[PDB]
């Protein structure tokens, strides 16, 4: 009887750093996917495995929404089989992703004059990320063979970087808000359904 709370996920006022992306489990409701692509304001709206307009006729055991922020040039790393800083070290998509990727420019919001350095991203890791894996550790990376007995120092680096979001930035580096919707069917009754499933 209560519809899924997508409005409060996109219109939310606060977004997380990409290495600290937030996942919400959506269940037990009817999601009107149309209102997403009816809002033809997104710079990225790409769906894999599922047709966006026929989503309103679909049922799922669970939906998952992953929200974060990246610089626009890195947006293309939000895709299956992609390679780069974000894909390897921040947020990795499986090669069979059945879901949609939505992104829109939020320079007016998340670029504060003099910089908005709150939004971060990971720079190194001992191994590339598995699908849907989040890492927010802050152990000092060891690129050097010698053990990192130092929090900071030669061949021992702090593994996080800050996005210098400023209103005069390049668009490729302007901040963009990103939502990933994944559709999981489990061997249990479906809980999220489209309006047209009638």
């Amino acid at each position, epitope marked *: 009887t209560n519809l899924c709370p997508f409005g409060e996920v996109f219109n*939310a006022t606060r977004f997380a*750093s990409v290495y600290a*992306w937030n996942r919400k489990r959506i269940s037990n409701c009817v999601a009107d996917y149309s209102v997403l692509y009816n809002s033809a304001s997104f710079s990225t709206f790409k769906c894999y495995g599922v047709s966006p307009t026929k989503l309103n006729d679909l049922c799922f055991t669970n939906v998952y929404a992953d*929200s974060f922020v990246i610089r626009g040039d890195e947006v293309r790393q939000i895709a299956p089989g992609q390679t780069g800083k974000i894909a390897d070290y921040n947020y990795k998509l499986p090669d069979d992703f059945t879901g949609c990727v939505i992104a829109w420019n939020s320079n007016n919001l998340d670029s504060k004059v003099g910089g908005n350095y709150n939004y971060l991203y990971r720079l190194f890791r001992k191994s590339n990320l598995k699908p849907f894996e989040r890492d927010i550790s802050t152990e000092i990376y060891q690129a050097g063979s010698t053990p990192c007995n130092g929090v900071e120092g030669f061949n021992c680096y702090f593994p996080l970087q800050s996005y210098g979001f400023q209103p005069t930035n390049g668009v490729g580096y302007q901040p963009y808000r990103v939502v990933v919707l994944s559709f999981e069917l489990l061997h249990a009754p479906a809980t999220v359904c489209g309006p047209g499933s009638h």
Partner: antibody
Amino acid sequence: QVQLVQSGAEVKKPGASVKLSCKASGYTFTSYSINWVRQAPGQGLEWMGWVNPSNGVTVYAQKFQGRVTMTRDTSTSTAYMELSSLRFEDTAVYYCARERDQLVVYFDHWGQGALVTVSS
Amino acid sequence: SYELTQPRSVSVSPGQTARITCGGDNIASKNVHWYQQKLAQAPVLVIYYDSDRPSGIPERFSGSNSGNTATLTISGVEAGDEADYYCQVWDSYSGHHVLFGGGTRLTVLG
């Protein structure tokens, strides 16, 4: 299913260091992270951090970092948390809890909590 | 940092329906969970993923979350349920924080 057995409620002087233990029973020890939450008397809950038994990754809160050290021991299936540079406002009940989900943080089981009081 | 808003205390006659709210800016974007801390004991999880109950929790417990509020509803409350209730969310937005609420002192005028 699962139990989290804590250590005794040690009680120490200001500026000292207190180390608490938490052993898990029943489940595969390294499958779930272990978090530590403290409670000031008559007040709310403060998240202190967590440690992953699988790899030894330790994550701390902004407030307690630089004083807290969380460690793991898989050969005994036991985690521990160490708090140094105690002040009076550290008088609290410290529980250990099991992180059921890593993406959506929420806690299955809780330790009975150990009472650490910092007075004169 | 961002923080959760809980009422001081809510009191109801036995058998009534107690409702404990949890306030946060677009708190629907994240998953909330509810823990019962009985009087002077270890807390225990009552509600998770905003609706689901652990196997063992009575069905009179029921959660919800939307807009700027998550609500815990206990129908047919008795004197036993009288305890403290804490709503907790994950907020990596604010520098890897496991955020709790201020608690609420449910009281039954037995």
